[PDB]
């Protein structure tokens, strides 16, 4: 498993953030840099066990059979969420970055650009 599917560019996230979090982005960038590099290394999982070999060749062949029906049944989970509240914070921070600031910016850039049509006089 590689980087989580969503990829935003490393300079477009990494220059710009709300004023409330301004210094925390440049740290969180480096924290996500070490995590994305640290996770990109790993073969996700080992091989299986050759069982008929292990049962023949460990001459304690009945200790072996416990560990078959145990290991063949005993399956590992992937770790869970605890911080996808960053996606709700991202929808709220897009309502802020887009809609709230976008429409407010479109009336303020127009406040100047309508004064630039007045400056044509």
């Amino acid at each position: 498993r590689k980087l989580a599917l969503k990829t935003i560019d490393w300079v477009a996230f990494g220059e710009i953030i709300p004023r409330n979090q301004k210094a925390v982005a440049n740290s969180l960038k480096s924290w996500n840099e070490t995590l994305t590099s640290r996770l990109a290394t790993l073969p996700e999982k080992p091989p299986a066990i050759d069982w008929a070999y292990y049962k023949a060749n460990v001459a304690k062949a009945g200790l072996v059979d416990d560990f078959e029906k145990k290991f063949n049944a005993l399956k590992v989970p992937i770790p869970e969420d605890k911080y996808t509240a960053q996606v709700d914070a991202e929808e709220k921070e897009d309502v802020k970055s887009c809609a709230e600031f976008l429409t407010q910016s479109k009336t303020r850039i127009q406040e100047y650009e309508k004064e630039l049509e007045k400056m044509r006089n």
Binding site: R1, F13, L39, C98
Partner: protein, 58 residues
């Protein structure tokens, strides 16, 4: 006479430039934070499943 007309033309474009860029900037990075963040998250959930298979097999 000449000063004020050129002065206004400068000062207006000064405030115009930053604000269309300020618009774009807030959107793009912040959308660009989101999917960034969630990389970093999902990165680890597979490792741990991944790594686990090796660890338990050992």
């Amino acid at each position: 006479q000449l000063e004020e007309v050129k002065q206004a033309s400068i000062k207006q474009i000064q405030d115009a430039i930053d604000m269309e860029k300020s618009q774009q900037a807030l959107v793009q990075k912040r959308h660009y934070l989101f999917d960034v963040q969630r990389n970093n998250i999902a990165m680890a959930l597979e490792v741990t499943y991944r790594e686990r298979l090796h660890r338990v097999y050992r």
